[PDB]
Amino acid sequence: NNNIIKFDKARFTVLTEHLIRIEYSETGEFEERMTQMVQNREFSEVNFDIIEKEETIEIITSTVHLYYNGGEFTNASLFADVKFNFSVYSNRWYFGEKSDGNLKGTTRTLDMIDGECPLEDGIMSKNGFAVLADKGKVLTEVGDIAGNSVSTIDLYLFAYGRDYRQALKDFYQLTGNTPKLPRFALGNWWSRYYDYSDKSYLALMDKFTDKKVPLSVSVIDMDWHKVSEVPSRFGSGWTGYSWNKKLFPNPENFIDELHQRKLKVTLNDHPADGIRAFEDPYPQVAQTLDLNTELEEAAKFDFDNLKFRKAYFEEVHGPLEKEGVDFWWIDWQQGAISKSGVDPLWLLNHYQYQNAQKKHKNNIILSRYAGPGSHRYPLGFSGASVISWASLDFQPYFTSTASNIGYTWWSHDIGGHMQGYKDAELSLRWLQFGVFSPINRLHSSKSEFTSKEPWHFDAVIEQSMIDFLQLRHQLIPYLYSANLITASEGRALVEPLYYEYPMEEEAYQHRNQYLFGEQLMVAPITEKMNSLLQMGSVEVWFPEGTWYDFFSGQPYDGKVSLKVYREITEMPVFAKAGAIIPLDKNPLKKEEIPSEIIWKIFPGADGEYLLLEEDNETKAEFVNGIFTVTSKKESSRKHTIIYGEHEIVSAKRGEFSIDLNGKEENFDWNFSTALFRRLDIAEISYEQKDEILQQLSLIEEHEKQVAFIKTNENQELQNSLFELLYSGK
Amino acid sequence: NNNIIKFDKARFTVLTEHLIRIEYSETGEFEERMTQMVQNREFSEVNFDIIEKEETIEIITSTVHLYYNGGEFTNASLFADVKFNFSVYSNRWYFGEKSDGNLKGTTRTLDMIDGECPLEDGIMSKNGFAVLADKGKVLTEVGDIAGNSVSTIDLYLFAYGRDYRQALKDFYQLTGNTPKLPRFALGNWWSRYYDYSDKSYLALMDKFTDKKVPLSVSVIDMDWHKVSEVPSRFGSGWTGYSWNKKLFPNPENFIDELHQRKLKVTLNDHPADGIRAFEDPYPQVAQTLDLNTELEEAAKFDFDNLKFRKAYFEEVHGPLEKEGVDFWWIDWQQGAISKSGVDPLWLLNHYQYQNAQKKHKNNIILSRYAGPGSHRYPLGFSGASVISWASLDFQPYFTSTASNIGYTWWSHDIGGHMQGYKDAELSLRWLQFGVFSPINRLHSSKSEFTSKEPWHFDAVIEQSMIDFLQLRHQLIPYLYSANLITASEGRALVEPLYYEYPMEEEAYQHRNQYLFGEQLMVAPITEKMNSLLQMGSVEVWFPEGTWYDFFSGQPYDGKVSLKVYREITEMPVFAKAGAIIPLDKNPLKKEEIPSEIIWKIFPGADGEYLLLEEDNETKAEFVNGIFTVTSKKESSRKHTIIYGEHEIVSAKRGEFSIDLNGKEENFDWNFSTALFRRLDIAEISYEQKDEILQQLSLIEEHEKQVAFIKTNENQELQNSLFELLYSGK
Ligand SMILES: OC[C@H]1O[C@H](O[C@@H]2[C@@H](O)[C@@H](O)O[C@H](CO)[C@H]2O)[C@H](O)[C@@H](O)[C@@H]1O
Ligand SMILES: OC[C@H]1O[C@H](O[C@@H]2[C@@H](O)[C@@H](O)O[C@H](CO)[C@H]2O)[C@H](O)[C@@H](O)[C@@H]1O
């Protein structure tokens, strides 16, 4: 209560030096209960100053002056100046007004979105402040909706300046941390809106195995249940809780077959038409909810109702879980209306996520975003994106920006959901992004033409998709370790560049560029290739330091902004000198944790990586060319070491140290080989190819090689050749 | 009161299985009085089911579940599920919310509209439900405004699925049927915003006669009254009730001359500036309304005021009716403001239509649309459209869609009203549409350059316009019979395709295509011709069955979507095998009812037509090749029979039967003649003409003729030649 101040009809709680709760109450009673958004207001004491007069109060922290002149909250009575100079005159917050600078957050869904859509604000601002209004209902101690807050205005003023990571950590302290995901969530998911049989689904899973594509999750979309078989008097077949017996004559046996293949199983649930009289569970639900069965009274969807929720979980979901369903895909698109005023999507995510923990430890849902704090109910499901280059070009930005409201587990339909147009290169670029996204779930529309199976495409596209799908499983150790860091430390897997580089203007000018964990920087290509180059491109900002392409070892001297070119089969992913990345050596092998880790080391600096696991922690240190691996607990795990180009240690057990000062630091990547390959694939004149190869071979001085390419009439070819010269400088 | 249910502060009236009145009352009193919209709530008893609990009620009909959870009406408390599967999740109505599917209705006016404008919703939805809010004032038993309803919310839930015609019939039962039009309303009207004299107007009417163009109505626009002669102290000359004596020195004599030519006469009335002190009727109105004549107090327009309305009808209109004015063109553009809150346009249409019945049986007005139920006051006047291809291309869609709110007598300015641009082909296409529209009124702006006289144009355009104007009068029997069917059975003359073909997707994809009565299907051409073809075109959907061009006999096998091409002088109008269409044999002859009917029969199927008239009903039956004509009452009428190509019976009196099994079924239309004509008019290379004529003559197999035209480099020429091959298959 030292950090609590009352003045007129207002209450101010100084939670941190940079976070102030602001309340109004007509009744002089203020709200202590949790809300849909806020789970915890216990924060360590902080120092601040007050100037309290007859008519006014000023609260002063290290970063903000908050002023209240009494009366009802207006833009004139309640306002704040930040103690920063990030702008010339955008340093003042006025109650109920917008200011410039917000770096945005996320939105409910990408349903029906072709390219960009507007986002809600987040808690991050280039000008150093943000206000997060709490407009939600209060909860009970066990987490049911209690009704309206007695704080009829309840706001959180964030004044973290450009300390974005601390703003997000303290947001997680206020709204609750993200829970740990289970390891299975981080592998490849298969999904398709397609009327598979038990037989054709298992045949497809076995084809994945034959094709060397690993999967963690088998999604079964809505054709699992009755659709066309629903009498039209009941409405549509969109909602269903009854297996189609022609396609799934023995559901538990089919789910047992997926479980024997080490797949987790989820079903699509369209909840909005509730439980109607044709459904297999209807007789039990009708008994529980005292429905008029002779008038075929439906159990209408009503998540405000405790008895409805219990019948839904116990008598509708329950029998399907007993057949082996592992977790629920909540696919809600029917609006925000309820008698309580609570969004039905929030009620579903909150209650289903809680219910999911009963049968499985660290279980998930798959559902759309339900507003600030809904990160407590992973995973995010963005929905029915339009299949286009424009949609892909929006999606990396969308994903990293979501970290600004703490929603760090978006699962996008990889390759896009529906409508749009066919382009196998779009499908391949989208999968590249997906593999370097929070979740890699392949999914598609009801079209006969939109399957994301790699072997849908030509041999080049197929092989590249298989390679990227294998890479996702190689990355599960790195992903699972980052997941435990999200849960315990409040750090997002995917960060916008400005989290690490808040004072670099270029960190705000590369919307689709992001940090992926702590060791990798990703610049997805999201534009159709230039046919004259047979390469796509993206402008990359390289921070200070020496950077390596993660795949090729091509080097780049930061700090620089440089257009980079890749063939459709290659993705721009970069690691600094000293980076250490663990990889599963056996990504196809079905085993709860890897029996073998590859330690991939980028030479040129010291580094360190901590591999967090279910039942271990393993530290890899690279210090003055000595690489050491230690673990809390011992195991039979075999460690492989790759130092730049070369495997140094194969399948060594236990803790150890090896000196790498003696070993070759340099990657094989060389200017001449890369130049020949770019000229060779280009759809340009052979005379141009001959002249460029000859002149760049003959001209010795780097500055004169650049002058030569500066004369080229092909402006994009100049930029491609300039990237090679910059790396070879 | 079995079909009436009260619950909390609500009342539900189950009017049909598919129509429910929904009311809220704070006072517990509910509204029994008629409203501006609703004239009748007497409906036959229907069966339905109720589930009534302590806190909730559910009403169940054959097609809808209506739910009310008590309290004030909100999107959460009042909602409905339809018992249809036309959509996957657009089958729920929420109070105060919009859903997808509405097929739209109409709007007040096309004043200042160049092309499309937004329309209001109608009662028709592809998803099977619509809500019609009653926001109007209550009426007295005699039809004066009584004030505010005691049902402060009063809604009609329509749940007819895709039974659009029954929805419209029951809408007419609720809001009152359309009245019968008089026969004169269905002929050609002449109108022009032009300062004619008595002499020049009669000279123009006599020129129509000399030119073989029949007219039913002589409109006199606002230059009938003082305009420039109004002193500026009184405001403008827009409103006027005083003849310009220079132009009309003897009005009654001039109107007697129009009456001797068998014309009905209407004057433009701009009511909004009321009756000012310069007007001829002002001294009488001033006496009646106790105005201060020495301060020249105006009788301001006030249709809320009983004494104003009586002075307007009796002392302003009355003297002009005594001079011979037959009906009123109410031309109101001055807004929706009144102290009552009732739109002055509604007050004008309601009261003027009632007043018009005093001197003439089944009299009309001509006025803009005044909201749902204003079909009770025909005719609709769409107003000041911009003269453009875009305006014409909107107008068929506009006209058929208006049937969805029961407003089936739109009169458009044929050829467009004002601004826009000159194109004699646009004028001709617009007249083609007009002739196949509810009303065929030629009208134009104050421009010296926008007259719709046929002889304004070149000899080709003039002759075609004269032919279409004669065709309108040939169609009056068919129109008048359809008019009596609108009045008695609630069936629109102009129907969207989806009224007849609700489950055919193509019936929703041909916006400008419509049924015209029960025997004809119209696809107006509303795009400028392709100069290379010298033909315009429209994509026609042909339903199942055998169809014939009404003019040429060109055949088409349904079901198919086919681009059809016509010269600027020809319009796509189609009749099914078995169609029977009556035509006036003597459209120029002035006679109250035709002394001679042509029965035009399309061979290939049975058919039937009922000709409703003022004092008769005549049935034409075509059954197993036997054509029979019978009538309720006998007459001297002479019947002509045309069976396909050939006149079989000329001028036969009385009831009779003739066997047509022996007679030639086939039209003359043939592929070779039509091919030669299309190639001959085309502005293409003579070498192409020669090759196409030669190859299509030489190649015998239909499939190889199509393959030949498929190679043509002119893509539109392919489609034109494909139409001929499809008809000749
Ligand atoms: O469960 C089937 C899919 O439903 C939702 O997407 C639908 C989409 O595939 C298509 O049918 O259009 C409708 C209307 O826009 C969508 O609701 C889910 O978003 C999707 O993931 C499912 O596969
Ligand atoms: O009575 C004359 C015409 O008045 C209305 O149209 C006017 C139009 O012709 C022009 O003068 O522009 C004004 C302003 O937009 C319009 O009010 C009627 O719509 C028209 O039918 C009359 O001929």
Author numbering:
A (entry chain A), B (entry chain A): 11 to 739
What does the paper say about this structure?
Within this cluster, we showed that a GH31_u1 protein from Lactococcus lactis (LlGH31_u1) and its fungal homolog demonstrated hydrolytic activities against nigerose [α-D-Glcp-(1→3)-D-Glc]. The kcat/Km values of LlGH31_u1 against kojibiose and maltose were 13% and 2.1% of that against nigerose, indicating that LlGH31_u1 has a higher specificity to the α-1,3 linkage of nigerose than other characterized GH31 enzymes, including eukaryotic enzymes. Furthermore, the three-dimensional structures of LlGH31_u1 determined using X-ray crystallography and cryogenic electron microscopy revealed that LlGH31_u1 forms a hexamer and has a C-terminal domain comprising four α-helices, suggesting that it contributes to hexamerization. Finally, crystal structures in complex with nigerooligosaccharides and kojibiose along with mutational analysis revealed the active site residues involved in substrate recognition in this enzyme.
In the −1 subsite, the Glc−1 of all ligands (glucose, nigerose, nigerotriose, nigerotetraose, and kojibiose) are accommodated in the active site pocket in almost the same manner and recognized by surrounding residues via hydrogen bonds and hydrophobic interaction. In the subsite +1, in addition to three hydrogen bonds with the catalytic site of A-domain, Tyr99 on the N-domain of an adjacent protomer forms a hydrogen bond with the 4-OH group of Glc+1 of nigerooligosaccharides. In the D394A-Koj2 structure, the Glc+1 adopts the same chair 4C1 conformation as in the D394A-Nig2, but its sugar ring is overturned. In the NtMGAM–acarbose complex, the α-D-6-deoxy-glucopyranose residue adopts the same 4C1 chair conformation as the Glc+1 of nigerose in D394A-Nig2, but the pyranose ring is overturned.
